[PDB]
Write a protein that binds this ligand. Sequence first.
Ligand SMILES: [Zn+2]
Ligand SMILES: [Zn+2]
Ligand SMILES: [Zn+2]
Ligand SMILES: [Zn+2]
Lengths: 1131, 117, 67
Amino acid sequence: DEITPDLWQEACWIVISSYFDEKGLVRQQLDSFDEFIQMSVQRIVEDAPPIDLQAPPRYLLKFEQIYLSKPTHWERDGAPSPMMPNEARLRNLTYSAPLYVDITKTVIKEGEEQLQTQHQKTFIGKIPIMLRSTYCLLNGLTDRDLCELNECPLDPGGYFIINGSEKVLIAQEKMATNTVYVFAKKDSKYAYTGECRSCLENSSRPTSTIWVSMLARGAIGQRIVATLPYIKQEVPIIIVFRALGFVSDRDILEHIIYDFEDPEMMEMVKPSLDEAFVIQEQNVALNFIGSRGAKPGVTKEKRIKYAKEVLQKEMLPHVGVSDFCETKKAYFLGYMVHRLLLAALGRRELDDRDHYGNKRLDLAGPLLAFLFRGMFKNLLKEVRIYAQKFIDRGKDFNLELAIKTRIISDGLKYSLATGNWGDQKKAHQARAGVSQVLNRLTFASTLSHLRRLNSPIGRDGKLAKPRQLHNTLWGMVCPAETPEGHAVGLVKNLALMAYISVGSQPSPILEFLEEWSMENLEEISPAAIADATKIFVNGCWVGIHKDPEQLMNTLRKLRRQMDIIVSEVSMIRDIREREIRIYTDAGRICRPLLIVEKQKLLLKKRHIDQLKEREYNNYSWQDLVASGVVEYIDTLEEETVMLAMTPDDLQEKEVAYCSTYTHCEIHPSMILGVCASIIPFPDHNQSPRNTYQSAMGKQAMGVYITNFHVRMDTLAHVLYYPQKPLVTTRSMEYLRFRELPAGINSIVAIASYTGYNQEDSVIMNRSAVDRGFFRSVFYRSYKEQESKKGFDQEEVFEKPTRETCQGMRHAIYDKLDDDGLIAPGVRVSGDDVIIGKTVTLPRYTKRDCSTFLRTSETGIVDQVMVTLNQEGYKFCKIRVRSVRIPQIGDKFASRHGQKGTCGIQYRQEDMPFTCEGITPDIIINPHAIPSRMTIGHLIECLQGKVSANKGEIGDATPFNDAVNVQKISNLLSDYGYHLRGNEVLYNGFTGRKITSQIFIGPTYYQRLKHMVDDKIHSRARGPIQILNRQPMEGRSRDGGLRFGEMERDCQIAHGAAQFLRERLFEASDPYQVHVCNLCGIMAIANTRTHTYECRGCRNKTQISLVRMPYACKLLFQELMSMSIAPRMMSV
Amino acid sequence: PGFVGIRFCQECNNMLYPKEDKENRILLYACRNCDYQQEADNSCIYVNKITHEVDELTQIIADVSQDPTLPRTEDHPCQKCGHKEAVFFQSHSARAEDAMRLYYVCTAPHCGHRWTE
Amino acid sequence: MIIPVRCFTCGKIVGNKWEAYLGLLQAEYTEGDALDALGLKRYCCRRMLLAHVDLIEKLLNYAPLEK
RNA sequence: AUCGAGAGGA
Ligand SMILES: [Zn+2]
Ligand SMILES: [Zn+2]
Ligand SMILES: [Zn+2]
Ligand SMILES: [Zn+2]
């Protein structure tokens, strides 16, 4: 029955495999989008108010149902056809499906003359579709079906195709809503502040933040204030309580202080009462609120109405926005004050801003919902204006012409295309970085980009606290994978078994709590709240309970049985403070864990047995979760959980550590993400090395996707001979690194050989490189289109001619065909022409606008595709193919942060060799190891020697006590090798033995995208910028290198004044001006007629020539634009 | 000394503020909303414990013994019920510097005795 | 994508051994014994056969450009 | 070609 330790390493990984058979790696994206389409769009459409318009006749126009068909495309003839994602990629279409809404317009004029007209399936917009979602044409297709459609079966999906560009929505971090968080700002007028970003269940407005603060000590005592929304002045809490109908101080403290035996709380609230005694009735308090507001009505009536509306709608919407909710709002605001007092009295800890239990991940669904709310509101507005301008004339109108569908369509398309998350007009208030271009450089880069999280703290911020690896990231975020540049700690990555909750309605839970012995908050007396336990659901205090323990037992039983409580519902019992917080909302990152009985796992051997035959008896992960054996625990419920790292922790020990565990890790290696799960032995490296590899696995070459032959990507690198690593971890089985690997096993020798590998460099074998070692192919796609925008000027693909075309370069166009397009198989060098495009003029009647190769490439045309774009003019894509043979300067890396460029390449006779004539493919310098402490590199090399000599794949899973260095060495000594991986090598040049026995063996190396040929650049009098006549910027522009301020300072320190003048004047922008010797302002010179005159001074004899930079002339002219007179006085 | 609690009027249920009656030279607690008055019984109006000599045993609740994440010990039996097992934990409360002190709670149900060594 | 022709290190021909290697593996050989049957004694050539991923078999799941 | 944004390298 029990899984014994000897079977555990199989059982756990069997369980893990079942998880990845059920979910995958992009499950969060697909589930978010599916919830958005199934629920969020319908909720948004129904939550909009019916637009009642009347001059008389009236019309309501109620939207009642939505229909999202499959993705289709409409040609110029208008025939709807099912559009495949690959066709969208090739034709630069948007993989979107039409959204139709049912509309009901009832005519009501008078005399009960009512009649309803329903417009079924009114086309309301087009919604882009996430690939492999339920509403994707690739849904449920087999691998054969996907290959029939020219799709990769290993492609995870989880992205959109907007204008042929694959866009991926990055999950955005945000502070959780409807939760009270008591912080303390050191530099502020308030000692403690308790904030609550409140938002109603079905979002319709932004988060309304309410603060309840305490004024810092230094009138008599500490005063509690409340910064309500839409009010620009602090308001005493007692005033707010009275404005809600609680005038008696006893009632207010009944709502705030639940234990009247506690004078400390009492004296700390007393200043607030003493400050509010002149106001003692609800109307006066409402008048005070309205007066403190930023729109103080001259008459107290409208002041009181405004205060009523604010306190009913903007104050704590999550508690309830309807009327008669003042009791719930009063209880909740009293809870906020109670929490603030507990913090000020030291009875509760301040809340941690960085705790991921306090955070939420805004995924594709809830982000598209924000867009859709804004866009549907704008659409209903436009419909209101259109219908109003017609009914004002007293006649009917056609809603089909009122609905301008471009709002929703173009809005979603623009937002996903650019990443600016918001309305196109508010292009600066909008937050960019959402919806990035999917990284297709290697399969690991694609997976990681699809599992990418973002902390929008702002890269400019230099506070390290949000960048720090918090304790609560354990199991939810990769500890290693993070960019090492300016976004350290802000851009994160999901751990492998991390699941972001999609969201759920609290209705069944609330109904069960009602049927259960919970007492509502309006029905109780406050005297009961002392000993009772509060119950919050999605931040709303809904009631109280008397035995929280057996309530938690009941709820956990219900969730483990897949009863009314779904698996993703978090249920935290804080014991010391008697809250029970239940969460069903979306964005809660959680992970699966094995539940533990008294001191035993519930995962018995029968579950492993049924999981082994997963493909026959359809016993899956969901059956494991439904059995009550596995549980999803979120960051906030982990605080109440006692984990076992392994079932070995559940053994009874000579001194028991815990003996009351509640859960167990499925495997600790699941704390790593996609790119860190490729590192072998990451627990033997320094952690920065693991981070650098997690970044560098994403630039590694491989086969980024199986269907690369049909993709017209702008840039693509494919390795000739990708190999799976000889030394692998058990997590790559689910990353599909074995099916799409990104490196080669290289016989690497760590040695000092000729000095060409010093300081992070490598010596490669020229003979190996000749045999296809780390050879790659680079595919570059050029796009072009001939626009017939108007009869004024039209472009067209056609072989240009020297007699008709004007802007025709001296490059030869013979490689083009009569259609103007080069043919595949044609070898093209730099500056060559691949598309001959000519544009009609207003060297006559047509000018050359041909597409050249990006300079200095020298490839062969791989293929040419011709089609029609969305509007329907001819559209061409040409993929050119360039074989990249590794060379000096190309960057290579192992899986341990050990990067370096090729210093030199030696032939096989020049490389050092073992007694059996094995030469290293790569030689790396021993000095790269000691400071870096990448012992995982050495253990991987030794394990790889054992694996190659044994005919297996080494197990480098991080935390594995069945694999240590002594075992690997003992294994290697059985194959006739030195147990530590050393060998006697001979000098290739002289054949003499090397005195020091070299450490050599197979290690998995990666070829990175950074090849020297894509970086080398030179300039000598090339093109210049228009504004300031200085060299351009970039290799692509043939630009010059920037001689910056620091270079100026260095050369000033050198004392090299002529070199400094050469760099900053003569090699950048030499220029001449003519200055009036009297006024010092630039004069008018006419060198052809030799007439120089200053219009200002009315002189034409006292002019002087001045040699100045063009940028300085431009500066002085831009100062004269500002009415400044910079007078260059030559005397 | 001990703290002093707030007391409310019997008519308006607002807090009673302190006042002095010169005629009898006696402390009274009177409402500044209604016209109620009361004869005080403590004679103390304000108390500040600067030292903050708070007995944290009063802040503990027996329910904490149900926490699976707290450590348990068999070495400190309960003086009230004789149960062997007991959870222990530190103060973890602000304004307490010498907070390495351990507080124990009996894990027997319905006993919930709390103490300190 | 396809089995290399030569071993990158020594230059021994491994191109003619992939199919035989697979046939030995379905014959219930261990990978080590299979590599021994094909005469790959240096761990470089054993690396070549043992770490190869036949991606061409997946690229042949797509219909060609011309029928 | 310009502007912005994003992704990267040291
Ligand atoms: Zn002049
Ligand atoms: Zn009174
Ligand atoms: Zn006891
Ligand atoms: Zn070889």
